[PDB]
Design a protein around this ligand. Structure first.
Ligand SMILES: NC(=O)c1ccc[n+]([C@@H]2O[C@H](COP(=O)([O-])OP(=O)(O)OC[C@H]3O[C@@H](n4cnc5c(N)ncnc54)[C@H](O)[C@@H]3O)[C@@H](O)[C@H]2O)c1
Ligand SMILES: NC(=O)c1ccc[n+]([C@@H]2O[C@H](COP(=O)([O-])OP(=O)(O)OC[C@H]3O[C@@H](n4cnc5c(N)ncnc54)[C@H](O)[C@@H]3O)[C@@H](O)[C@H]2O)c1
Ligand code: NA
Ligand code: NA
Lengths: 516, 516
């Protein structure tokens, strides 16, 4: 197989009339279909259930955006049978054939990008560019993994020869596994976590987040049209602690690919370490969990550039990103100039229905709203509220961009993942102390430094202990291929997405010697 | 760093007078040294304790080969402090410097090879060639990992460029971890599991098996002479279920590198999945566990070649190998001719004190003897005893080469790892049934096929589900670099030793972007 060198899918900015027209058209088509019901997808067919899952518009939660079937234990068993049956033959496809299937799915996704973006807007409250970035990232994962999988093809392993023998080492896929996905990147991460394992010959049972079941179904429409053989990919919307846990704990689940909260990741990793009755392998579990990400700014920085990057990083998709800047660490010389600029910019941010392309849409659910508001209450006891900190008018879950200052580094709002538009500002003496404060959390996902001082940047390169570090730019929006994505410490297992290393996680090696 | 291409250390056969003379002198000096005491090694110094570990000669267990100090919780804590302190600076050594340190250790081990072989003869009852293979493999691990580590050096990751930015991804070591090692390859596997992680900048607390503490100490003499900085490698002989478990469960242990029984591996993998109080990472655990390994022979095979390779694979080091042929699966046409030849060869095998260079020395301990004899009793009620099945006369733990035939595939002796000189012969119709029987165990470590039929060999290449498969040769003695070693299923986590992929297990990746 020979295709063009990988390039990232351009993120639409909607600066042209044609792009805005195309978006409005997509928004209309999507809302005209709010009545739709999407079944499970098991063994190559759409299979309905008695019970259902309801998905709401977080900008107008009295409005249903769609319903799906609801997978329980019986449907999990059906999916397991289908996935193990498919594995027996899918594992034997030439890599070139599997890679071409991914490339087809990517081409189909690219053709439906406005529809998918519009679905993100209405289902999870992304503004237009956040939605476009999400879909473009999904396309990127498919294009990238299609190509990366060829680097592992039979027989890929470099071994030392021995006289009178052929020695041949090669990779084989593991089996059928479960993918458990979050609501915050429910096209990008959902797609990546499925197609990586699948590309190299695994089969997958995919469990979308409850808040993003409709857009997950639309991704499965693409997989179905692409023509993945029956059982290779399966769609099981349902309750995480029910069907999700059932699959995690199952003796016949070979691996678990999880992205989500630390709370859940901890349970999954623990369960994965147990031998279920009758289980005949050591389960692999990849858990990519939260962050408490900081941007450090020192007195040598471009303060206007820093302020812009901080606001983008803190408030993009309402701060509901594992990569979001939730801490702003300012050295004494940087404190007033940067804080004043951050406040001036943040106070100009618009909040409203996502479809109007505001700076911020709503948080995703009543539960998220409750969590973020509860953290705002905690923060009022720990630091000084200086901006926002309120729900805004309307049924939608609109929360104002929030800033706390004078926040102690060990404060709950400085340690715990709030996952909302809440920035904690911490004053430190110098760069050394900035790094100490940056590192002193249980997490290690993203981080940033604004500074012109070379020695500070290079010191951070060595010592700011996060998996994805950025200098003089935003700390969100890691691009597939460019910035292998994944953290340290309780940010998870360091499964680096959009990197060659990712696919190795879903392979095991056999060594076969013939003495002639 | 530029060195000669890797080559495996030749295994001494002792056919020349020069080799015999050298070995006789080494054995004499080791024997003259019986009763020596070896302290712990923590933070670059030898540290004694009040309690001790006693190491007996299994050929004459009234004889004490040596004693060591005994590590408990306080010593584990001291080692943790030393290893983490050392990690802070060891991780920053240029890879070339760390690799040169390994190469020095290899040169020192090579110069002491006869002494180390002699120590294995007395301490774990290896005959001369089994001892030589063990030490040669240890040297191979050091030489191989020293070179492989350079392939990961800063900045090693292939990434996609982005306009206006430098994007740099690179590997960093994890931290301080624990190595927990078996008695059966107490130089090779002990050395490999330590030096791999250490090569790429980790630090290690090494827990040798109780029955092999003296030879573990001699490996540490080499590490000390080589000049590893204080704290980089630490030696904690002690009780596995005490100090070993303490380290496995500790919130400050970053990774666990384990090779040993399935029973213990299961406990370790489960414990590793738990977040210990105050722990700030997801522990990595590699567990390389047992096997129930089969050789298939069909009617097309060279029966004489097959019988020789079966006898070598089944009885080498008294069957005390994770790779040992404990099952012989014969198609109908192969049954009589191969079994006849196997019995005739096996009944000629000598058994006696390992110093005499017999075909088989003793099993390693009274407990091992008890377990093997117990399995022989079980076997008598499951299959047909046709050779051996007895303890031989003498103080040493001598067990005769044993063969059961017409063994049901689901019999305990056909399923459970006995780890002694006990071969279970299984009669099947054809090659298809041979593969079914071969695959139907909880394990998946080594396997072999003797056949001249190309289609049967290539079928096994695809479907005989073991990590290390060999055609028309013995299934033991995987060579570093040549045959990446490690299994499937309950044979472990497929950490492939003596392969480039091994070192990746002890690294995490950071991605750093600078926008100019
Ligand atoms: N590290 C990363 O790459 C990354 C990326 C995106 C999001 N996240 C994290 O995701 C979190 C937000 O996503 P979320 O709210 O969907 O997380 P969540 O943990 O609540 O749920 C994630 C998924 O797990 C399922 N689930 C819930 N409980 C389960 C259980 N006990 N067993 C099995 N499955 C269960 C849910 O139904 C959902 O599909 C944040 O912490 C964020 O940091 C991390
Ligand atoms: N897969 C492989 O590469 C491979 C290689 C060699 C040996 N083995 C396996 O090793 C076994 C024989 O070795 P062994 O008898 O030394 O095995 P073992 O499991 O009894 O002990 C191995 C090590 O673990 C320690 N240990 C025991 N209990 C522990 C606990 N609860 N927590 C932490 N550590 C503990 C022991 O002290 C020893 O150091 C066989 O099953 C064999 O197949 C596997
Ligand atoms: Na929704
Ligand atoms: Na001993």
């Amino acid at each position: 197989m020979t295709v063009e060198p990988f390039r990232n899918e351009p993120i639409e900015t909607f600066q042209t009339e044609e792009a805005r027209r195309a978006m409005r058209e997509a928004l209309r088509r999507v809302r005209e279909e709010f009545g739709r019901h999407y079944p499970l997808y098991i063994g190559g067919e759409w299979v309905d259930t008695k019970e259902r899952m309801v998905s709401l518009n977080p900008s107008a939660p009295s409005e249903v955006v769609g319903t799906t079937a609801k997978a329980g234990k019986a449907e999990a068993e059906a999916a397991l049978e289908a996935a193990w049956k498919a594995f027996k033959t899918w594992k034997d496809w030439p890599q070139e054939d599997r890679s071409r299937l991914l490339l087809k799915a990517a081409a189909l996704m690219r053709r439906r990008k406005r529809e998918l973006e519009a679905t993100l807007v209405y289902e999870v409250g992304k503004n237009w560019v956040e939605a476009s970035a999400d879909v473009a990232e999904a396309i990127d994962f498919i294009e990238y993994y299609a190509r990366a999988a060829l680097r592992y093809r039979y027989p890929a392993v470099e071994v030392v020869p021995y006289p009178g023998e052929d020695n041949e080492s090669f990779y084989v896929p593991l089996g059928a596994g479960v993918v458990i996905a979050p609501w915050n990147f429910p096209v990008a991460i959902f797609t990546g976590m499925i197609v990586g394992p699948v590309a190299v010959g695994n089969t997958v049972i995919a469990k979308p987040a409850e808040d993003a079941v409709v857009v997950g179904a639309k991704v499965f429409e693409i997989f179905h049209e692409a023509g993945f053989p029956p059982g290779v990919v399966n769609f099981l919307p349902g309750v995480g602690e029910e069907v999700g846990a059932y699959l995690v704990e199952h003796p016949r689940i070979r691996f678990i690919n999880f992205t989500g909260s630390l709370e859940v990741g901890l349970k999954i990793y623990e369960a994965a370490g147990r031998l279920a009755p009758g289980q005949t392998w050591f389960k692999r579990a990849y858990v990519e969990t939260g962050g408490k990400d900081a941007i450090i700014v020192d007195e040598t920085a471009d303060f206007d550039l820093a302020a812009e990057g901080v606001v983008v990083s803190a408030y993009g998709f309402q701060g509901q990103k594992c990569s979001a800047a939730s801490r702003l660490i300012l050295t004494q010389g940087a404190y007033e100039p940067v804080l004043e600029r951050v406040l001036k910019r943040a106070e100009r941010l618009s909040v409203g229905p996502a479809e109007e392309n505001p700076d911020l849409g709503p948080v995703v659910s009543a539960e998220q709203e409750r969590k973020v508001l509860s953290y705002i209450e905690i923060g009022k006891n720990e630091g000084q509220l200086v901006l926002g900190g309120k729900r805004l008018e309307g049924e939608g879950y609109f929360i104002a961009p929030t800033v706390f200052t004078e926040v102690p580094p060990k404060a709950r709002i400085a340690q715990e993942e709030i996952f909302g538009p809440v920035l904690s500002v911490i004053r430190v003496k110098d760069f050394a102390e900035a790094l100490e404060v940056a590192n002193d959390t249980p997490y290690g996902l993203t981080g940033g430094v604004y500074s012109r001082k070379r020695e500070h940047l290079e010191w951070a390169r060595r010592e700011f202990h996060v998996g994805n570090l950025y200098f003089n730019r935003k700390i969100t929006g890691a691009l597939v291929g460019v910035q292998p994505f994944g953290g340290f410490k309780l940010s998870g297992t360091n499964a680096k997405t959009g990197a060659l290393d990712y696919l190795r996680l879903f392979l095991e090696m056999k060594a076969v010697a013939e003495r002639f």
